Ligand binder design. Structure first.
Ligand SMILES: Nc1ccn([C@@H]2O[C@H](COP(=O)(O)O)[C@@H](O)[C@H]2O)c(=O)n1
Ligand code: NA
Ligand SMILES: [Zn+2]
Ligand SMILES: [Zn+2]
Ligand SMILES: [Zn+2]
Length: 248
């Protein structure tokens, strides 16, 4: 997602946190003055842009290209050295839940988790290696060029012309998505990447024309918005499991 998609996923999640998870998130955020779950949500993309070390090393953590294998993820094939969103979200979830670590180390893991639960719900972040998740699939949207990746990250969301205050209650107004009964931090990332990949491969998502506009938006913007709500709900479920109560 673009910055607004990331923040919306965090805003949807923030409202669903159980009291134990809410208190812990607020403790980790407090280590960084003025940080909120929304404000950190785009941080991992800024790190990629600005940091020629960890930013360059983390770039592959934002996606996993499995559509050529019909959305059947295999870690040794698609995620050599753990450099993809499935393995990165798993490890950062483990790190976030490690209470022996400093609040500073856990806040950094929270920044990655908030971001990656967002990206792993953007269909094009689980799409084709051939066109780099749509980045190399150029098209005309209205009268100006974009690419199919950008169109799903932000192009269609931008057509609402809402700030977060306007967009958040629209996502909350949607029918409740189907979640797993329970969070499994080690297994859900693959399940989510595969589900996102299956949307990238749905009839029409790749259009049969170079030029698209309001017809594409009216059919697919609802699916992009369903994925934001689903990401936000999945992110709260994950935070509630990893940062929730530890009795016994
Ligand atoms: N041409 C581009 C494409 C993306 N980007 C950045 O990448 C972000 C999206 O990264 P993800 O694909 O990881 O969602 C955008 O919010 C923007 O900051 C950019 O700065 N220039
Ligand atoms: Na609601
Ligand atoms: Zn994103
Ligand atoms: Zn993207
Ligand atoms: Zn990203």
């Amino acid at each position: 997602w673009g910055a607004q998609g990331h923040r919306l996923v965090a805003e949807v999640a923030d409202a669903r946190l159980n009291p134990t998870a809410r208190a812990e998130v607020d403790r980790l955020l407090a280590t960084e003055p003025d940080a909120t779950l929304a404000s950190i949500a785009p941080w991992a993309d800024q790190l990629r842009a600005k940091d020629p070390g960890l930013g360059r090393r983390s770039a592959g953590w934002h996606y996993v290209n499995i559509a050529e294998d019909n959305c059947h993820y295999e870690a040794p094939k698609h995620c050599r050295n753990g450099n993809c969103i499935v393995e990165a979200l798993k490890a950062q979830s483990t790190i976030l839940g490690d209470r022996s670590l400093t609040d500073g180390e856990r806040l950094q893991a929270l920044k990655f988790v908030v971001h990656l639960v967002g990206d792993i719900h953007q269909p094009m972040h689980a799409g084709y290696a051939h066109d780099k998740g749509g980045n190399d699939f150029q098209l005309q949207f209205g009268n100006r060029g974009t690419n199919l990746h950008s169109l799903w990250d932000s192009g269609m969301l931008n057509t609402r012309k809402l700030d977060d205050a306007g967009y958040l209650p629209l996502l909350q107004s949607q029918r409740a998505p189907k979640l797993a009964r329970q969070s499994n931090p080690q297994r859900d990332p693959q399940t989510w990447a595969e589900a996102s990949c299956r949307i990238s491969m749905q009839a029409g998502v790749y259009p049969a024309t170079r030029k698209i506009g309001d017809e594409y938006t009216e059919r697919y913007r609802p699916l992009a918005e369903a994925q934001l709500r689903l990401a936000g709900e999945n992110l709260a479920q994950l935070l509630n499991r990893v940062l929730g109560a530890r009795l016994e």
